[PDB]
Amino acid sequence: FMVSLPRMVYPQPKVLTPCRKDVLVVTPWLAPIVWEGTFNIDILNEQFRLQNTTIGLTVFAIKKYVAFLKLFLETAEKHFMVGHRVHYYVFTDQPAAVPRVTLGTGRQLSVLEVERRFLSEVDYLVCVDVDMEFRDHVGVEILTPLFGTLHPSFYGSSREAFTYERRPQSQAYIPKDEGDFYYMGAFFGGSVQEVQRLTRACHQAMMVDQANGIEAVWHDESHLNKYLLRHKPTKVLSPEYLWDQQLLGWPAVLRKLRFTAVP
Ligand SMILES: [Hg+2]
Ligand SMILES: [Hg+2]
Ligand SMILES: [Hg+2]
Ligand SMILES: [Hg+2]
Ligand SMILES: [Hg+2]
Ligand SMILES: [Hg+2]
Known part of the structure; x- marks a missing residue:
């Protein structure tokens, strides 16, 4: 059950003015592709706050x-889901080395030394790499049952150039005439249920490959790409959400650089 939005004053959407004319903003299976200019964050913030949404952010360090x-x-703390409930889960072999970082209200951090706990604690899970920094807004515009992120090196590439696993002997195999996008393994997420489905599927496929003596060319990323080929994501994040400015500069098509590699 979703309550009514309050009265809000914002610019009328214009049916006969495309949103962005330089990029694809919707996939062929009608999932939004999230670029700056496509969303009114005030409307989305209202929608997700009214559901008291909790976002889990998982990182392995x-x-x-x-x-x-x-x-x-x-x-x-500056850029990720500010205003919303956030639970950070830091998986680490060095619990005592996790830095004491000051958190805003409604935000918490759990240290797990190296599950159904996620189902009870958060609504969405966001799975990212730790050797990154947030540089701009990453908010509830990303939230959906299942999302992947366009790899910054391949968003302009034709599918035959994608570094999918190409050996038929691997469970991650994708032939040259298949593929929508090349998704990067470093930023995906969804509802807890859909993320656990994905991670279970990839773990099983990886075990099958191990038993057959084969390791996919890009490991978990290869399996992610196979999963998202066969189970279409309900949103796709643009490379605003996973960028490397030293490697790739700042192309015109990126109005914001939100989450980036560390120099
Ligand atoms: Hg627009
Ligand atoms: Hg995760
Ligand atoms: Hg993770
Ligand atoms: Hg998979
Ligand atoms: Hg896996
Ligand atoms: Hg995966």
């Missing part, structure tokens, strides 16, 4: 990667 937690979490 092992060995030397614990060094990246401070910047990751500090910048998440």
Whole structure:
């Protein structure tokens, strides 16, 4: 059950003015592709706050990667789901090395040393890499049953150039005449239920590959791409959401650089 939105004053959407004319804003299965200019964040914030949405953000930080937690979490505090309930889950081999980062109200951090707990604690899960920093808004516009993110190196590439697993002997196999996009493994998410479905499917496929003596060319990312080919995501994030400015610069098509590699 969803309550009514309140009265809001904003610019009328214009039916005969395309939103962006330089990029695809909807997939052929009618999932939005999230670019700056496509969303009114005030409307979306209202919708998700009225549901008291809780977002879990999961990161693995092992060995030397614990060094990246401070910047990751500090910048998440500035830019990630601000105004909403956030639960950070930091999976690490070094619990005592997790930095003491000051959190805004309604935000919490759990340290898990290296599950149904997610079903009871959060509505959505967002799974990212720790060697990153938030540079701009990453908010409820991403939330949906299942999303993937366009890999910044391949968003302009034809499908035959995608680095999918190409050996038929692998469960991650995708032939040259298949594929919508190349999704990057470093940023995906969805409802808890859909994320757990995905991770279960990939884990099983990886076990089958191991038993057959084969390891997919890009490991979990290869399996992610196979999963999202066969189970279409309900939103796709543009490369605004996963960028490397040193490698790739700042193309005109990116109005914002939201979540980036660390230099
Ligand atoms: Hg628009
Ligand atoms: Hg996750
Ligand atoms: Hg994760
Ligand atoms: Hg998979
Ligand atoms: Hg996996
Ligand atoms: Hg996966």
